[PDB]
């Protein structure tokens, strides 16, 4: 019993974090092989007025860099720019580089943040990509370069390099190809993120997990078909329900099918009571996450 937003064990990523320092800027970077990935605003003169990145890259001097893994300092061979990242060649190879891939995450997918400061991991926690391409995290100054990852059968998929905090407090990264999530700019401009909508397949996984935990006051008697729900969904801040097979196991263990949850989702969208600790509907648990905390295989 119990439901906790969890992270995967961080060990295979901890040894990849380095400190990247240029001038008076200092942030984190990701050291894979003989190259270090880090956000490009480390080379701006100021980060409170709009930055011209093509200028900053032209007047850049490698000797101005300071990159370190612990108290071992690495030397900078070359530096190229890709999207919002810098790719920094270094004269030292990371013997601890894990088997890795890059992946861009879609909304509703869960991953892990290794929150780093001054080149060292400080915390690990799981997040979920929202529809507005933001995440609800805990990052302060110095946190940029903090990677998001998933571990898959022994491969580390890197999907996120932290970049900025919007005026709302929501957090934005790029993927490891350099492309910002959601087309946001790495500028200190007033940016307002779009409406967020709940990834309803995760909301179902969460309601099932609540029914297993023995929470059942919210269940409803009526039932609505998937297609009817989908045309209500898009006007009430929820995504459409596409794949129903994912839940094929939860119903068995609960005796309540999706159609019963869909009709229940329409009621809660509510009245002072709680579900598994939550006061409104959350979309931050994937089905594969709930499967593990309820069963394990």
């Amino acid at each position: 019993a119990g439901l906790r937003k969890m992270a995967q064990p961080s060990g295979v990523v901890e040894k990849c974090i380095v400190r990247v320092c240029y001038g008076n800027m200092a942030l984190n970077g990701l050291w894979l092989g003989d190259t270090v990935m880090c956000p490009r605003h480390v080379i701006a003169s100021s980060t409170t007025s709009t930055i011209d990145y093509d200028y900053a890259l032209s007047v850049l001097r490698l000797h101005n860099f300071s990159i370190s893994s612990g108290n071992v300092f690495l030397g900078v061979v070359g530096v190229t720019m890709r999207g919002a990242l810098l790719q920094i060649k270094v004269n030292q190879n990371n013997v601890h580089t894990p088997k890795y891939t890059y992946r861009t995450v879609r909304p509703g997918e869960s991953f892990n943040i290794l929150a780093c400061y001054d080149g060292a991991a400080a915390g690990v926690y799981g997040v979920n990509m929202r529809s507005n391409y933001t995440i609800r995290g805990s990052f302060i100054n110095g946190a940029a370069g903090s990677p998001g990852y998933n571990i898959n059968n022994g491969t580390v998929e890197f999907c996120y390099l932290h970049q900025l905090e919007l005026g709302s407090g929501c957090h934005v990264g790029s993927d490891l190809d350099g492309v910002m999530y959601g087309g946001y700019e790495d500028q200190p401009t007033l940016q307002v993120e779009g409406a967020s909508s709940l990834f309803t397949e995760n909301v179902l996984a969460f309601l099932y997990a609540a029914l297993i935990n023995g929470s059942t006051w919210w269940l409803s008697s009526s039932r609505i078909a998937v297609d009817r729900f989908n045309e209500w969904a898009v006007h009430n801040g929820m995504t459409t329900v596409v794949n129903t097979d994912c839940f094929s196991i939860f119903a068995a263990k609960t005796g309540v099918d999706v159609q019963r949850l869909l009709a229940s989702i329409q009621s809660l969208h509510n009245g002072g009571k709680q579900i598994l600790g939550y006061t409104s509907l959350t979309d931050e648990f994937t089905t594969g996450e709930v499967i593990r905390q309820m069963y394990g295989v």
């Binding site: 302060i140 900025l164 905090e165 919007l166 007033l190």
Partner: peptide, 6 residues
């Protein structure tokens, strides 16, 4: 509020 590069 302006966005904060971190």
């Amino acid at each position: 509020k302006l966005s904060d590069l971190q």
